[PDB]
């Protein structure tokens, strides 16, 4: 995110993130390494935890998991999100 963790550098390949799209919840996902193609240069590979669906985000859509689990980590209607907090916790390598 902004300032704290802005950059691309701050997160490797297996960083278990909440990962921030318009109209969305935070939503539980990872760092994946790139496929590989020319990928955006100033993005990073992120898998949804729960849908299993994949973008590329920015830093400032990215923020660590655990120091946001209790603000970001809990149960959403959405389709997919509980199962998706079930897997960043118990299943964090599922591909």
Wanted: aromatic share 16%.
């Amino acid at each position: 995110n902004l300032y704290f963790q802005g950059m691309t550098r701050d997160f490797k390949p297996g960083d278990l993130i909440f990962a921030k799209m318009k109209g969305y919840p935070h939503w539980p996902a990872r760092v994946d390494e790139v496929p590989d193609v020319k990928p955006p240069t100033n993005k990073l590979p992120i898998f949804f935890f729960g849908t299993h669906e994949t973008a590329f985000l920015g830093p400032k859509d990215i923020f660590p998991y655990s120091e946001n689990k209790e603000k970001y980590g809990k149960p959403n209607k959405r389709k997919g999100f509980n199962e998706g907090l079930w897997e960043i916790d118990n299943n964090p390598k599922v591909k």
